[PDB]
Ligand binder design. Structure first.
Ligand SMILES: O=C(NC(=O)c1ccc(C(F)(F)F)cc1)N[C@@H]1O[C@H](CO)[C@@H](O)[C@H](O)[C@H]1O
Ligand SMILES: O=C(NC(=O)c1ccc(C(F)(F)F)cc1)N[C@@H]1O[C@H](CO)[C@@H](O)[C@H](O)[C@H]1O
Ligand SMILES: *Cc1c(COP(=O)(O)O)cnc(C)c1O
Ligand SMILES: *Cc1c(COP(=O)(O)O)cnc(C)c1O
Lengths: 810, 810
C-alpha cells in the first residue's frame, strides 16, 4: 500500500504464507477450522521471529570474532510495548506480511491488537531504556540490555466509579514468542551470610543462594541486519515428615518472588527489602556474565577498554561495590588498581532532582543482606572523604554534605553519592537539568571533579514513534525528501522549504484528520464514548504526579466550562480534553486527582448548554500501545510541569514529531525544543526556574492568588462546596487544602499566564492554514530529539566507541 | 541394525536430518559450534514431535465426526517416564532416527539419557495409568487421561551416609517439548463459600476461584496412527498502599500451590487440606470438559451412552458428588434421574486392602472447603442406608458398618463406600485380591449388590517393557515367530515349541549376558561400584514398605554371609543382590530399612574372605528409566510380600517378560503368573492367605521362631549387638523391637521356607541349560499380563465399547 513499509515481492509473500501455515500446524497444533484470531497472531509472530534468528546468530558470532568494546546498559526497567510491528518495520517486512495475511483472508492490524505489551517499566526512564536499545542496534554498537524478567509488569488500570483500581498484568499468560530461555546459562547469586577475615583476605560465607536464569530477547537494528540481545534474569530456587517435605517444596516461592513483580512507585523511594534483593540480583548475575565474556576474549588493566557499564539511575548502583568485591576478594587485585578499573568502567545517569525520589538505603538492611558490600562502601567513603579533605582543608561541613553515609535517626547510604564517586562520567538528561545538577544537589561534587559532569539530552526512536505509529505522516514526508531521514532525523529540516507549499500543507492537515477519525472510532468501539473529531484534541498523557500539574490542566478545564455557562451563546473553539496516566498505588493525592478528572467529566459531558463544545475524557490504562494511538491524533501537547522539576520529558518529543503543537513551561527538554523550532512556534508560559527561586525566597502564599483572581476563587468555591460531588460534598477537601496551604509546585502562580496562553492556542486553531504551517515548523526541527543523536553522544563522549551505519551481510 | 526397530529408508533419513538442523537453528537458536548434547536431544525431540502432530489432529477430528463413546481415565498419578524412545517405537521411526543421528555424527542412545523422567507418580498405581494410556491408544479407544501437571514430581533420592535424602524433582527446568499449553481452554474451579437455599433450589455462593489451565500431551498407539490425549491441569490465580499491592501479587502463589507438588506418601493416608484441594481441582475441571464435549455432540439420558468415567482408586472419588451437583443444581435434573446417570457413568478400581491406605476425610475439612458436596454426600448416604435397611430389616450393625459416615472422635467420610454406592462397577486388580474384597472389607456391599463386583487382573505394556527396554530379546523372538506378538502378546505361547531348540536356548542366555554386561558397566560409569557379571543377579525393586518385606530379603542376605564366614572354603553360587526403591518421607521404619541395607553392604562388600561371591548394592533413585535398565539384566525377581497384602504387583510381570525367574509368595498376580507358567517353573514359598489367617486367630508370636531357629537367633543378636553398626551399637533397635514384638507382616514365619527355596534357586542356576529352559517357559506364558488384555476386558465388561486394531490413515 505505502512505500516506507517495504517491498511485497512474489517470492517473499509465497514463502511467508507457507511458513505461517507450517507454524499454525506444527507449532500451535491447530487446524484452520478451530483457529482463533489469537492463534493467527501467534503463527505470524513465529513466522517473523524466524527471520530474526539467522541475523541474531551471525551478529553475536561477529562480536566474538571481532571482539569490540561491549556496552552494558543496566536498568530495572525496560518499557518495551509490543514487538511484532517493530520487528516487521526494522526487517522491511511489513508490506509483505500485510499482503501474505490478506491473501490468507486475515487483517494484520486486527492480529497486531492481540499482542500484550511488555510493560516492564513505569514511564519515561523505562521507555528511555527501550528507545536506547533500538538506537544502539541501529548504530551498530555491541550493546546488551540487562534487567529483570518480571512475571507481572506495571498493573493494568481499571476505572470503577471514577477511582483507579489495580489489577495484575499477567502478560506471560499466553506465552512470549520473542524470548528464548537459556537455562544452561544459569548463575548463582548470594544473599545474607557473614564476612570472615583470613590471612588471604575477606571471605563472604554462610550465604543463601538464589539462581539467576537468563531469557534472551532479540533487538533488531533498522535495516542493517544487526540484532542485539536484551537479557532478562528470572529467579529460581536451587534444588536442595510429609508436612515438612511438602512445605520445603512450597517455600521455593520465597526465592522466586525476587522476579515476580515490578515496583510501581515512581514518586517516592521506599526502602523495601524485596526491592533491594531485585537490585542486587540483576547486578550480581550481570557482572558474572560480563566477566566471563571478558575472560573469553587475566589482565584487568584492559577491562575498561573492553567494557562499559551504564547505570540507568541509581537502581543498579550496587554494580560499583560488586565489581570491587569481585576484583579484590576473588581476583586478588589490590584496592587502588581495582578502584581505577571500576571508575573507568562505570557511568551514571540521573533522572530527577526531587529528593523524595532519590535512593537512600538504611544501613541495617545492607548489613543483614549484603554485609561485605557495606564494608566496601564504608571503605570507598573513607578514601573519598580523604580526597575531599585534602582539596578543601578545614571545610568540615563539606565533608558531612558529600559523605556517602548520611547521619541521623536511621543511618542511610546515599546511592547517588556512591554513583558519582565510582563513575568517570555523570550526566543529566536535558541541558537545564544538567545545569541544575551542577548548581544545586551535586554542586560539591562538581567543585571536586568538574570533568565528570556532562549533559546528554534525551531522545526518542523515530522508528516506533513515527514510522510505526504514524505511517500516513511518514509516507507524505518520504514523498518529498526520501526515506533516509528514518535513520538520520536531522534531514527533516529539508521540510522547511515546504512551509509555503499548498499541496504539503493540505497533506499534513489531512494526515492529522485521518488520525483523529481513527482514534475517535477507537474510543467508541473499545470504550463506548462519543467525541467530536472537528474539535481541538487537547492531550496530557503521562504518569500522575503533583509536579507534572495535571491539576493546573483541571483548573483550565473548569475555567472554560464556567465561561461557557456565563455566556452560552458566545462562540468558543470546540475542544476534546484528554487526560491519561497511572497513579502509583500508595500515592493518595494522585488517586484523588484521577477522581477529580472523572468528576469534572461527569458534570461537563452531561450539560446540555455545553453541547459538543467541551468534552473531558480520562484515558484508561495509558501504556506504550495506547501512546502509539493517541499521540498521532493530538493537536495540543500539554507539558506544564513547574519549572525545574521535570528532568527532561520524552512524551513532549513524541508529540512534536507527530504534528501537535506544544503548550508548556520552560522546563526539561521543552527549552531545547523551543530553541530548535523558534519560540514563536511554541506556546511558552509561566515562571522560569529563576522566578520559582525568587518566589521560594519570599515565601509562596497561595491565598494571595485566591484573593486577586475572581475566576480562580469561583473554582475553589465550587470544589469546596460540592459542585463536582453532590452526594459527597467534602470529597475534594484534601485537594483544596493542599492547593491553599501546602502546594510545593505553585499551581496558582502559573494559572493566569496559562489561561491567557490557552486563549492564544484557540485563536490560532481558528486559522487552519497557519496552525498547519506552525506544525510543519515543529516537525521540521524535531531532528535533534532522535535517540540516534543521543546514543551517538554517549558512544563518543562516555563509552569511547564509534557508531556505524554499515550493514552486516544478510 | 535390528528389524523390530523399523525401516531406515533413504528419503526418511534425509528428511529427518534437515528437520533436525532446522530445529537446532530456528527452534533452539544455536549453531553447531556451541551446541551441547542437551541441545541435540531437544532438536531430536522436536523433530520426532512433528511426526505426531498430523496424526494427533486427525485422531481428535475423527472423534468429533464419528462421536464414539468417550472413556475418561481420572488419576492423581501418571508415572510416564521418558517419552522420546517410546514415541519412536510407536511411530516405527527408531532405526531411521538412529541412522539420521549417526550420519550427523551423534549417538542417539547418549541423547536419550538426557531426557528427564515425567515422574508424576509414586509406583504401581501411577505406572498402571501410564501403561493403560498406551494400551487404550493401541486398541483404538476414544480415551483421555486426566490429571494434574505437578511442577515437582516424585523426589529425587540421594543416599548420604547410608540415609535417604530427598531433593526436589525440578523436571520442567529445561522445558517439556511434548506438552502443548492450552491457555484458551482455562476453566474456573470453586472452593470454600457457603450454601444458599432458594425457591429454585440450592446455590453455592461466596466462593474463592482458582483457574485450571490445561496442558495436552500426545499418547501414540502402536503403529496404528492413533494419537490420544493426556490432559493435565495447572493451577492459576485469577487476575483480580505499595506494600499491600506488592503482597497481593505475591499471594497469587497460594492459589498456584495446588499443582506444585506430588504427595509422596504411598503408605499412609494423610488428611491434608492441600491434598483435598488437588483432588477436587482435577475433578471439577475435568467434569466441565466432559460435559462441554458431551453438549457439543440437553438430554442427559444418553450421557452414560457417550461417557465412561474410571476412578483410579478413591483419589478422584469427588467426581461422584460433583456430577450430582452439576446435574441437580445447574442442569435442574431431579435427584433420582441424576443418580441413575451418575451410577451408570462411574466405575471404581481398588488397589489395596490395607486400612491405613484408605481415604477417610474428616467431615470438618469438607464442611469448610466443599459445603455443598458434604450436603450431597449426606443425602447419598441416607438414600443408600434406606436401601440397606429394606434389604436387611433389623440388621442395625450392618447399617453402621456400611455407612459412608464413620462415627467416632472425629467424624469421617469413607471414600471407598462412596465409590461403591455411586458406581455400576467395582474391580480389584488380581483374582485373589478381588476375592478378598468380596470376603472381607466389602463383604456387606457384595451381599447387597453382587453384580457390581468384578476382577480385572493388571497388565503391563509390551512396548515399553520389552521392545523399548530389551530390543535384543524382542529381536530373537521376532526371528522365530514374527512381529505380531508386540500387539498380541498371547502369540508368545508359540515359543514353547522352541524349549528344546539348542540355537534358541543359546540366544536367550546370550541376550541376558549382554544385558548384564551393559548394566554392570552402567554401575561403574555412573556410580563407581564393582560387580561380577557372572554372578546371579538377585533383584528386588519397588517402593520400600513393611508389607513388601525387603526385611525378609535382608535376613537371607545376612544368612548367606554368615554361612560363608562359617565355611569359607566351600563353594557357593556367586550373587549380586540388588535392592532399590524410595521410602515415603515420613515413614521412619522404611527409612531405617534403607539404612540397614546399606549397612549390610558396608560389611559384606569389604570382607576379604567373601571375595566376589556376595555383593549387596542399594540401587539409588529407582524410577521408570532405571527400571528399564535393571529389569532386562535380572536373573531372579523377588516378589515376597506377605500373602494377602500386595493387591497385584506389576513389577513381577515386567521381570517375567524379560527373562528372570521368580521367587515369591502366593500373593497378588504371582498366583496367576504361577498358574500360567506352571508351578514347577516358579519358586513359590511361604504361607498362603489361609495360613496367615490361622496364625492371626492363634496369635503371632515371633519369639517362638527366634527360640527354634539358631540361624535366625544369630542374625538378631548381630543386629542388636552392633555388628552392622560398630560406632552406633543400638542403631537398629527399632527394627529388632518391631520384628520381635510388633510385626504385622510375619517376617519370621516365612524365613525357613524362604531360605530353603533360595537354595533351590542356587541349585538350578548351577545348570545353565535348565535355568534357560525354565526362563523360556516363563516368557512363553507371560502373554496374559499384557495391558492390552486388561484394557480389552475393561472395555467389554465395564465401559461397554469394542476395541479395534484397525489403522487410521497416515
Ligand atoms: O521515569 C522516571 N522515573 C521513574 O520511573 C522512577 C522509578 C523509581 C523511583 C524510585 F526510586 F523507586 F522511587 C523513582 C522514579 N523518571 C523520568 O525519566 C525520564 C527519562 O530520562 C525523564 O524524561 C523524566 O523527566 C523523568 O521524570
Ligand atoms: O501404588 C499403589 N498405591 C499408591 O501409590 C498410593 C498412593 C496414595 C496413597 C494414599 F492414600 F495417599 F495414602 C496410598 C497408596 N498401589 C499399587 O497399585 C498397583 C496397581 O494396581 C498394584 O499392582 C499394587 O499391588 C498396589 O500396591
Ligand atoms: C513516553 C512515555 C512516557 C513518558 O512521558 P513523559 O511525558 O515524559 O512523562 C510515559 N509512559 C509512556 C507509556 C510513554 O510512552
Ligand atoms: C512397575 C514399577 C513399580 C511397581 O512395582 P511393584 O513391584 O508392583 O510394586 C514401581 N515403580 C516403578 C518405577 C515401576 O516401574
Amino acid at each position: 500500500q505505502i512505500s516506507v513499509r517495504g517491498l511485497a515481492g512474489v517470492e517473499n509473500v509465497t514463502e511467508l504464507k507457507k511458513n505461517f501455515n507450517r507454524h499454525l500446524h506444527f507449532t500451535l497444533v491447530k487446524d484452520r477450522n478451530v483457529a482463533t484470531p489469537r492463534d493467527y497472531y501467534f503463527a505470524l509472530a513465529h513466522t517473523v521471529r524466524d527471520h530474526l534468528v539467522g541475523r541474531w546468530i551471525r551478529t553475536q558470532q561477529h562480536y566474538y570474532e571481532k571482539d569490540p568494546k561491549r556496552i552494558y546498559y543496566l536498568s530495572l526497567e525496560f518499557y518495551m510495548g509490543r514487538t511484532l510491528q517493530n520487528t516487521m518495520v526494522n526487517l522491511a517486512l511489513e508490506n509483505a506480511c500485510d499482503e501474505a495475511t490478506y491473501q490468507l483472508g486475515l487483517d494484520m492490524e486486527e492480529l497486531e491488537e492481540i499482542e500484550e505489551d511488555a510493560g516492564l517499566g513505569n514511564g519515561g526512564l523505562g521507555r528511555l531504556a527501550a528507545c536506547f536499545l533500538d538506537s544502539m542496534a541501529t548504530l551498530g554498537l555491541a550493546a546488551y540490555g540487562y534487567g529483570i524478567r518480571y512475571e507481572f509488569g506495571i498493573f493494568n488500570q481499571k476505572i470503577c466509579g471514577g477511582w483507579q483500581m489495580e489489577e495484575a498484568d499477567d502478560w506471560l499468560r499466553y506465552g512470549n514468542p520473542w524470548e528464548k530461555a537459556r537455562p544452561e546459562f544459569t548463575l548463582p547469586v548470594h544473599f545474607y551470610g557473614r564476612v570472615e577475615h583470613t590471612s588471604q583476605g575477606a571471605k563472604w560465607v554462610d550465604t543463601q543462594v538464589v539462581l539467576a536464569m537468563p531469557y534472551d530477547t532479540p533487538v533488531p537494528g533498522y535495516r542493517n541486519n544487526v540484532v542485539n540481545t536484551m537479557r532478562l534474569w528470572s529467579a529460581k530456587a536451587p534444588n536442595d515428615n510429609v508436612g515438612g517435605y511438602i512445605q520445603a517444596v512450597l517455600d521455593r516461592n520465597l526465592a522466586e518472588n525476587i522476579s515476580r513483580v515490578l515496583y510501581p512507585n515512581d514518586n517516592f523511594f521506599e526502602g523495601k527489602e524485596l526491592r533491594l534483593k531485585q537490585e542486587y540480583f540483576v547486578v550480581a548475575a550481570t557482572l558474572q556474565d560480563i566477566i566471563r565474556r571478558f575472560k573469553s576474549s587475566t589482565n584487568f588493566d584492559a577491562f575498561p577498554d573492553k567494557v562499559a557499564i551504564q547505570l540507568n539511575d541509581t537502581h543498579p548502583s550496587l554494580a560499583i561495590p560488586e565489581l570491587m568485591r569481585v576484583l579484590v576478594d576473588l581476583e586478588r587485585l589490590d584496592w587502588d588498581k581495582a578502584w581505577e578499573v571500576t571508575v573507568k568502567t562505570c557511568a551514571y545517569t540521573n533522572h530527577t532532582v526531587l529528593p523524595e525520589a532519590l535512593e537512600r538505603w538504611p544501613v541495617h538492611l545492607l548489613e543483614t543482606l549484603l554485609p561485605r558490600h557495606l564494608q566496601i562502601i564504608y571503605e570507598i567513603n573513607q578514601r573519598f572523604l580523604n580526597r575531599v579533605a585534602a582539596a578543601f582543608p578545614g571545610d568540615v561541613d563539606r565533608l558531612r554534605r558529600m559523605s556517602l553515609v548520611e547521619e541521623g535517626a536511621v543511618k542511610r547510604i546515599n546511592m547517588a553519592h556512591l554513583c558519582i564517586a565510582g563513575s568517570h562520567a555523570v550526566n543529566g538528561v536535558a541541558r537545564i537539568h544538567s545545569e541544575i545538577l551542577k548548581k544545586t544537589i551535586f554542586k560539591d561534587f562538581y567543585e571536586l571533579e568538574p570533568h565528570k559532569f556532562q549533559n546528554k539530552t534525551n531522545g526518542i526512536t523515530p522508528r516506533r514513534w513515527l514510522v510505526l505509529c504514524n505511517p500516513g505522516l511518514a509516507e507524505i514526508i518520504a514523498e518529498r525528501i526520501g526515506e533516509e531521514y528514518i535513520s538520520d532525523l536531522d534531514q527533516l529540516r529539508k521540510l522547511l522549504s515546504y512551509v509555503d507549499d499548498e499541496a504539503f500543507i493540505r497533506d499534513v492537515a489531512k494526515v492529522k484528520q485521518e488520525n483523529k477519525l481513527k482514534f475517535a472510532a477507537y474510543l467508541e468501539r473499545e470504550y463506548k464514548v462519543h467525541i467530536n473529531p472537528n474539535s481541538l484534541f487537547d492531550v496530557q498523557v503521562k504518569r500522575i504526579h503533583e509536579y507534572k500539574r495535571q491539576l493546573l490542566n483541571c483548573l483550565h478545564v473548569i475555567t472554560l466550562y464556567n465561561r461557557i455557562k456565563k455566556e452560552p451563546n458566545k462562540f468558543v473553539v470546540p475542544r476534546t480534553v484528554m487526560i491519561g496516566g497511572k497513579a502509583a498505588p500508595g500515592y493518595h493525592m494522585a488517586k484523588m486527582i484521577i477522581k477529580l478528572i472523572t468528576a469534572i467529566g461527569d458534570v461537563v459531558n452531561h450539560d446540555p448548554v455545553v453541547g459538543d463544545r467541551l468534552r473531558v475524557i480520562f484515558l484508561e490504562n495509558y501504556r506504550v500501545s495506547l501512546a502509539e494511538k493517541v499521540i498521532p491524533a493530538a493537536d495540543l501537547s500539554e507539558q506544564i510541569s513547574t519549572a525545574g522539576t521535570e528532568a527532561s520529558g520524552t512524551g513532549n518529543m513524541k508529540f512534536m514529531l507527530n504534528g501537535a503543537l506544544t503548550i508548556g513551561t520552560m522546563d526539561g527538554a521543552n527549552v531545547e525544543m523551543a530553541e530548535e523550532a523558534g519560540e514563536e512556534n511554541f506556546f511558552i508560559f509561566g515562571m522560569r526556574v529563576e522566578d520559582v527561586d525568587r518566589l521560594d525566597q519570599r515565601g509562596y502564599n497561595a491565598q494571595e492568588y485566591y484573593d486577586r483572581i475572581p475566576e480562580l476563587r469561583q473554582i475553589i468555591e465550587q470544589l469546596s462546596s460540592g459542585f463536582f460531588s453532590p452526594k459527597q460534598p467534602d470529597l475534594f477537601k484534601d485537594i483544596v487544602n493542599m492547593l491553599m496551604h501546602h502546594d510545593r509546585f505553585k499551581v496558582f502562580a502559573d494559572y493566569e499566564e496559562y489561561v491567557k496562553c490557552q486563549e492564544r492556542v484557540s485563536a490560532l486553531y481558528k486559522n487552519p492554514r497557519e496552525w498547519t504551517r506552525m506544525v510543519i515548523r515543529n516537525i521540521a526541527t524535531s531532528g535533534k530529539f532522535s535517540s540516534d543523536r543521543t546514543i551517538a553522544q554517549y558512544a563518543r563522549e562516555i563509552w569511547g566507541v564509534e557508531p556505524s551505519r554499515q550493514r552486516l551481510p544478510a
